[PDB]
């Protein structure tokens, strides 16, 4: 009966599945659930494990160089994730690549471009932080730590290794969402795409746009996973996209496709498919006005990435 | 007269030419306007005909003759729009990124070159964004004050696009113009203190950083440098300019200091600058900043105070 905990923490316990000497833990599988699902299949139920059951669990963790876009799906149930590590992973999913490269370089006095187990522990705790009423009345090892630093914690973590860990995690979650809609096929429909974007938006706007795609001319092909992932990378750098659309000033004008494509490239480095861009415009234009309005688009997308996970 | 905002109050204060009703800075007047507090002779415009102005322009150096001494060599034989005063001010104050943004944005036709007509429109964009920043600022002022009580050719245009305006301006060229202008102004400040020598002193530096900051706090720092142990070598112009480049990236420096961890040491500060900007200061440069600002509080520098002095310095 805990009214004493914050929103995020409440959630963590809600999905967590392991208790070991009093502490709670997600599995890898629980974490993917936590960032894909609204509520768990089994809520607030902790299987208790021995210190050894846990060690044993851990000893079959792959080394960092066998990491992949399928690390978590492969580990599934047999692994441990701390609540701090949960917030760390959420940061890797939601925030832009920049802050990580900066903070890692900042902690790499000793390295170089390598980090110690202890340095990583502190760096990760940093990311976590980010009277009148009287008057009225009167450390434990986890999959990530073994993965990054080996079994007795003595390895050092290269920056490029860790950076591709970040990429892998991002691609895993994206693949899971994309599969959700594709049931294994190569592409997804305009409607699938739209539903993914608008899924976390006010149901008024979602009404208009979804009926726009359902009523519109049929698509010729679908969105590959690559166009999908490109688009969500762009969602990580939405801030600079807005920034860039500002100096392409001045009247909050509306953007055409070649315009919008150029804007994406310049502000983020990514070169969208002509097809991906066209698909954006079919979702959102609603013939307003054969060109897209950037500040409406920025609004819904602002919402989508943050509250999607 | 009194109908005008701060910025053009100055433009007219330093302007020197009237041609068919419009006012203009020389290159010289612009350097003054950005380096000294008042003009030598104020609000006096010698009037010119379009044909005099034209001829004045006809001896404008081509783009490939630019340098960190372009404006000085132009002297008074040149013309600068009020719009262009603001554009050049933007070049001096804002971070490079935004310029790469809008040039890349207008370079459908180029590529990576821009047309004269494209440049004119882009420049008009930078103007309207300045206009209503100031206009909304002033309306905001008078609003709370109420709450309490109740096309023509130019030095730049010929320089960038030739004499009949038909060349295209390459990106490498324009970015190097930006750089040259910035080092011109810096070199002038540095001369101001060096009277021609190779270095300026710790106290010179300190005075330069603090000169446009509230005089209480500046006082404490200046007496710190005056009382402390003597400098061994003083700072070269190269360290000087490096430091002002770094001040253009102050925002990213702050963010670097936020996600890092207000107790910062010299090795910290060195790394922080490097991470946030690519630049590696001399050990001497870092040491001198610390001698000026620490006031032995306490061999550590105060992160949010220093950022404060420097917001002030740059704006």
UniProtKB/Swiss-Prot annotation, chain A:
**Binding residue positions for Ca(2+) 2:** 285, 287, 289, 291, 296
**Protein known as:** Calcium uptake protein 3, mitochondrial
Mutating residue 285 to A: what's the consequence? In EF1(mut); abolished calcium-binding
Q: Which GO terms describe its biological process?
A: calcium import into the mitochondrion; cellular response to calcium ion; mitochondrial calcium ion homeostasis; positive regulation of neurotransmitter secretion
Keywords annotated in UniProt: Calcium, Disulfide bond, Membrane, Metal-binding, Mitochondrion, Mitochondrion inner membrane, Repeat, Transit peptide
Q: Which residues bind Ca(2+) 1?
A: 108, 110, 112, 114, 116, 119
Subunit note: Heterodimer; disulfide-linked; heterodimerizes with MICU1. Component of the uniplex complex, composed of MCU, EMRE/SMDT1, MICU1 and MICU3 in a 4:4:1:1 stoichiometry.
Q: Which GO terms describe its cellular component?
A: mitochondrial inner membrane; mitochondrial intermembrane space; mitochondrion; uniplex complex
Family designation: Belongs to the MICU1 family. MICU3 subfamily.
Q: Domain EF-hand: where?
A: 95-130, 203-238, 272-307
One Gene Ontology MF term: calcium ion binding
Q: What is known of its domains?
A: EF-hand domains 1 and 3 have high affinity for calcium and act as sensors of mitochondrial matrix calcium levels. EF-hand domain 2 is degenerate.
Q: Which residues of the full protein are shown?
A: 138 to 507 of 530
Q: Where does it live in the cell?
A: Mitochondrion intermembrane space; Mitochondrion inner membrane
Domain of life per record: Eukaryota
UniProtKB/Swiss-Prot annotation, chain B:
Residues in coiled coil: none
Q: Is Mitochondrion a UniProt keyword of this protein? A: yes
Q: Where is it found, in Gene Ontology cellular component terms?
A: mitochondrial inner membrane; mitochondrial intermembrane space; mitochondrion; uniplex complex
* Record flagged with keyword Transmembrane: no
Which residues of the sequence carry a binding annotation for Ca(2+) 2?
Answer: 294, 296, 298, 300, 305
Q: Which GO terms describe its biological process?
A: calcium import into the mitochondrion; cellular response to calcium ion; mitochondrial calcium ion homeostasis; positive regulation of neurotransmitter secretion
Tell me the domain comment: EF-hand domains 1 and 3 have high affinity for calcium and act as sensors of mitochondrial matrix calcium levels. EF-hand domain 2 is degenerate.
Cell compartment(s), UniProt: Mitochondrion intermembrane space; Mitochondrion inner membrane
Role played? Tissue-specific calcium sensor of the mitochondrial calcium uniporter (MCU) channel, which specifically regulates MCU channel activity in the central nervous system and skeletal muscle. Senses calcium level via its EF-hand domains: compared to MICU1 and MICU2, MICU3 has a higher affinity for calcium. MICU1 and MICU3 form a disulfide-linked heterodimer that stimulates and inhibits MCU activity, depending on the concentration of calcium. At low calcium levels, MICU1 occludes the pore of the MCU channel, preventing mitochondrial calcium uptake.
What name does this protein carry?
Calcium uptake protein 3, mitochondrial
Provide this UniProt record's keywords sorted from A to Z: Calcium, Disulfide bond, Membrane, Metal-binding, Mitochondrion, Mitochondrion inner membrane, Repeat, Transit peptide
Q: List each copy of the EF-hand domain by range.
A: 94-129, 215-250, 281-315
In the record, what terms sit under GO molecular function? calcium channel regulator activity; calcium ion binding; calcium ion sensor activity; protein heterodimerization activity
In which tissues or organs does this protein occur?
Answer: Specifically expressed in the central nervous system and skeletal muscle.
Q: Which residues bind Ca(2+) 1?
A: 107, 109, 111, 113, 115, 118
Assembly, in brief, is:
Heterodimer; disulfide-linked; heterodimerizes with MICU1. Component of the uniplex complex, composed of MCU, EMRE/SMDT1, MICU1 and MICU3 in a 4:4:1:1 stoichiometry.
Q: Which family does it belong to?
A: Belongs to the MICU1 family. MICU3 subfamily.
């Amino acid at each position: 009966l805990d009214l004493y905990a914050t929103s995020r923490e409440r959630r963590f316990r809600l999905f967590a599945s392991i208790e070991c000497e009093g502490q709670l833990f997600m599995t890898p599988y629980d974490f993917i659930l936590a960032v894909t699902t609204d509520e768990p299949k089994v809520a607030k139920t902790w299987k208790s494990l021995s210190k050894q059951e846990l060690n044993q669990m851990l000893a079959e963790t792959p080394p960092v160089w066998k990491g992949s876009s399928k690390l978590f799906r492969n580990l599934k149930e047999k692994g441990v994730i701390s609540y701090t590590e949960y917030l760390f992973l959420l940061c890797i999913l939601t925030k832009p690549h920049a802050g990580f490269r900066i903070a890692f370089n900042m902690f790499d006095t000793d390295g170089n471009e390598m980090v110690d187990k202890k340095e990583f522990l502190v760096l990760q705790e940093i990311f976590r932080k980010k009277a009148m009423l009287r008057l009225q009345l009167y450390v434990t090892d986890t999959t990530l730590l073994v993965h990054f630093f080996g079994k007795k914690g003595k390895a050092e973590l290269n920056f490029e290794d860790f950076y591709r860990f970040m990429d892998n995690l991002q691609t895993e979650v994206l693949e899971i969402e994309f599969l959700s809609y594709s049931n294994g096929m190569n592409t997804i429909s305009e409607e699938d795409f739209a539903h993914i974007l608008l899924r976390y938006t006010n149901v008024e706007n979602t009404s208009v746009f979804l009926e726009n795609v359902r009523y519109s001319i049929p698509e010729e092909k679908g969105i590959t996973f690559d166009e999908f992932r490109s688009f969500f990378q762009f969602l990580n750098n939405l801030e600079d996209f807005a920034i860039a659309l500002n100096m392409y000033n001045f009247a909050s004008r509306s953007i055409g496709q070649d315009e919008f494509k150029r804007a994406v490239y310049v502000a983020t480095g990514l070169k969208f498919s002509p097809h991906l861009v066209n698909t954006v415009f079919k979702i959102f234009d609603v013939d307003k006005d054969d060109q897209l309005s950037y500040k409406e688009f920025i609004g819904i997308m602002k919402d989508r990435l943050h509250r999607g996970f």
